[PDB]
């Protein structure tokens, strides 16, 4: 519905990789970046996070094409960057480069329809082009992979799309 | 909202079997039974060539092994799809595949998957259906970019597993 | 109330000229200018004949004597439309007709013009426009009968001749 | 949303019968019996186009063998029908028609049908009716350029025919 | 709540004249210059004797000696009006009227003075409205019987007689 | 909403004076069945014009029971003015000891059930005659104190009769 | 809520003034000069005795010296009032009163005063109105009882003095 | 619409009685037994004198004598109540009193009867109810005027009168 | 909501200064300049010693010092707060204190504080407001138990010291 | 709007973790007729600021046995984000191995049914007691982080329990101070 349309509007307060917080606003991306907005329900939960890191071992390919990755859940900034300071063997995540948003009120959720019985995001990715413009989403109910492969390829393909139209 | 994590929204719809039959499908013929995958596509016949349809019908066999049912859906009439696979794939038709079409003549299915267009025509869309009917996967594009077999293959088996 | 003896309802459509490419049609292109003859048939491509809108293009040099534009109108795309045009008649198209064909993709001219069946699919049915937009003579037939193209005629004639001298049947 | 194509909307009208008597006639009477051929026109005693409903009466016997009930339909009272017959045709009357008359004198049928002009008379119409009561042929005119029986007999025959043939 | 003792609603309607030709009649283009008694019935062509208009009409020069305009009304179009005054009286007609006669084929006229039958036809009426389009006076009959002329008369009187004299004895 | 002239008269009840001067209370419905009802209203006593036409309906009032119909005088006056006007001799512009019923419509609303309220303040001058069944066969308003003599009511009533029973004559 | 010690409702109404002629009188024209004892009544020619009425009346120059303007008032129209002045004392009337007496014809008077009972008749009440145009005083009684004048005077200038200095 | 000349409103309140303890009042317990004398006043330890009710207590006899029961009621609780009984009048209390004070704490009563001033305090009041709890008598002052027992006693006199006989001819 | 962490609900009430006279005092007269310890209890003149009030007298110039205004309340009059200044502690009065009493005569304080108890009389709670407007404390007790002045003082000196 | 003090406590159900970390469910009604609740509200788990409130508070478990209490705590936090707070320890910023339950009020409902949510994000810090016909007896809320001594908590709850049964006492003296 959102799908083709301007991605609502989003502001947040957010750990980024130098552990510091701070806030990121949607607007302050339009006509210079892409963004690459990840959902994930919770943090310290008992699936380990395999897709969080996986994505940031491959944030210079997002970087090459000038896209920001976002990663949130309804946690707290302070949640956020405790789960960063948590050993991987402990089920943490690491000392990741990417920004975490934090959903406090949860109605960034709301805004994006992925909030799940009042609580907790589901899993999700969504991609906004320089225009502010979604141009694909992905909602996953279950706690199954997605592979960075399959989002780059992604990406590339909107991107060539985006400026060469669709022939084959 | 969202309907992913929950039950798929209720459909009825005239269709073209893989045999070029006509014939009727509704959501629920397939409750306690079948998975299901639901692609949509905004139309027939276009200049965008139809890739993703005839990669998804080559892996026919792979879908009835993990007891999925494909269905694909556009806004087009039943006579259309069926015409459609008359044509050959040189001339821009989709040839005779084998899996089943779906007619939504009258939109309403996909203003109920909350995928039709500016009220004309559906956006490039798969859902994945469990046996129960709940709603386990949703991917809108807007583009026609298309979507791997294997990506989707592996989404099926994740859910199996 | 009916719109008959009252003004068209604007359309503005996708079409699909004779020469095969793609454009737009508004109702309001022709209101100085032109008598518009609308027809709606339900689809393209079913397993019945084509039969009448081939025989409307065979005489539509009869219409532009009479200075009527012909418009058809179905529900499918304008992609479906010229997919019909370039099937052969022998195959059940409609080959290379000469007069546009308008896409009423989103169902609101069947729905304004109150033809559309089921919310799905218009009727066959017939629409003739004065020059000033205002509709004179409304045919909506549930099955596939066809209507000569010699009472299109006729009628068209009456109602030009109506519209300047007595308006007098007999008869 | 139009009728066509579904069940007609039911009506009930005082009318004169061709044996000049009131009564009554209502779209019940003829579902699983017959066809019914419903015209509208808008005013007795006008002199715009007596003729066309002579020459439908004219042509009854087509329309039994059809088997097809004529009904003609204006917004005059019946009383107003019934002086119309009684009227001689040189005065441009209607003579003794055999065909029933509806008075549809609170306009009710006529907003019905969609065929109700300025809240004042019908325009000139004609409904088909199935054995089953479902509208199958509509046609409205906003000009009197009448139409022949001939037309109309032979949209009945491809209607009858496509029927059976389902073509 | 009612109109008697306030301005007539306003009518426009096609009328047919005393010559027998066409045209309209309009409350106001009376307004400052003649009373207007407006009577309703039901219907022209039925089995009930038109004597109640017979009457009216015979009076026709009483009532102009009174500055009024006589208008008969129903819901009928002009033409039914035309053809009921071209039939003679043997024959269920009106002959031919000298005063005019309204076409109700909206049925407003009827909707608006509130002498409608179910959706239909009016009553019988009578509307007396003043030079200064004020109603001094109604009658309706769901019946047909009559109203004497010279009660109409005698009435249209005394509604004369109290605008000039006030309240008597 | 369309008059009532076709169908049942609106109920009414009210407080009122009888003929012998006690009070008491009428019911529209206490003559269904049995009575013809001519209600008449007026808008109030003690005003400056003559209350001739109450005089006059009130001599004829043998006539009204030999038609089975009963008399009914009707305003917005409490029943008390009511019986004092009665007091008042017609010397003094009063209306004497009269023997028909007079009802006080006190609250105003017998007037507007019947569409004969001005202003929210008083009636019209009206006649209204309610048949057995309970059906308004005749309604006529007036504006202005205009008489309307009892020949003229007696002919309508016998003609309603008329046409109640037998047929409809020319 | 009650108006009292606040702003009197306001009201205008055709009245019977002492040398028997039909006027008006309006809240409005008392304010900033007088003050208005307003006193209701149910009903003219009752079977209570109207000595109230009567009593009220040859106090009217007690009334003068306070600045208080007496106005009688009741749903009965102007009619009725002047004819009960025209009906002797001896008779039941009230005779030839010099202050002035309202109609409540609508009784919409009643209805904003608060005394109106069963949408019919008011209750006897008496309101007094100070020169700002408020409300200071208010008595209902649902029974024919009396009310002194000497009590009302009373109350009048006990409002007054309150007026002047204090508590 | 007023509640004069019909049941007075309901109320149960918490009570000072005479006897310096603390109870409940409540209106239906009168009903069929005793006419009640309702007053209101602002408020307790006013500098305003309580002449009032200390003259109302004076004439307590008088009011048994006519079967009324006597009730002064103010938006107070009972321990201010209590509290004004406890101060000489000499401080500007009102002594021991032997008619029971009613606290309308919740502003209710005073709403329920009309008096309530700015959502604050009662007006000045006294509402006279009948055996049948029908109120016959209502008075109000904006102002701290008195109102002397005895045009009281006379009202209660002339509507108990007036029970009995209709209304009295001379004055 | 609370409108604890938020700005104080406005007020203003007729009110019995130390001196025992009447004015009126409202909230607005304290934001930008002072801090505001407001106070509410059910009712004057009960069978509850006033224990609470006096030890709170008892440190006024403790609050004086900290720059803050003691404001205490009820929904009684203000007539029915000077009689109890007037009743001396021995007779179950409050005696002369020092400190300004607030009359709640309409509920209004107690409706907008939310210690409104069955539309009568407030709750005993205590309402710590900065000199910004910003309530930063709230205690609510539904029973008579007291509460230690050296708590009160203890809070106040938190909040004045870290932020 | 009105105030639940004095009156019953709003009904909540919440998923919880207990002193042995297994995860659960706690509800008000398991409590009437049986125990006190002493439910408290903080912010948040991991923040800057020391945790002392909860440590001391676990701290003193036996005294609130004793006074028949379930000591309740509860942010807007996970049932995963209090276990994993439990199993860091407080040299890692962590609360260690606390005996008493936390509740996770993952909706905000129960803060917001409470009155305590602050800016529809984190509850503020505060104190509630129910006694054991499930009435409100006492409500404490701060904006800061400024929080009750756990000697302070104790005394409240002894003079509430002791009013229950012998009402208001007047103190010795009082008139002095």
Known sequence: TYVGKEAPFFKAEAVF???????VNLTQFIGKKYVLLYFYPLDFTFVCPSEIIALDKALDAFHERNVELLGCSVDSKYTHLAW??????????????????????????????????????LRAFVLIDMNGIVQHLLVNNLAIGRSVDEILRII?????????????
């Open 17 to 23: 990789g130098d552990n510091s917080f701070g806030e």
């Open 84 to 121: 960063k300071k948590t050993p991987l063997a402990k089920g943490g995540i690491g000392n990741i480069k990417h920004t975490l948003l934090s959903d406090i009120t949860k109605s960034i959720s709301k805004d994006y329809n992925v909030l799940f019985d009042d609580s907790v995001s």
């Open 156 to 168: 590339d393909a909107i991107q060539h799309h985006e400026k060469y139209g669709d022939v084959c």
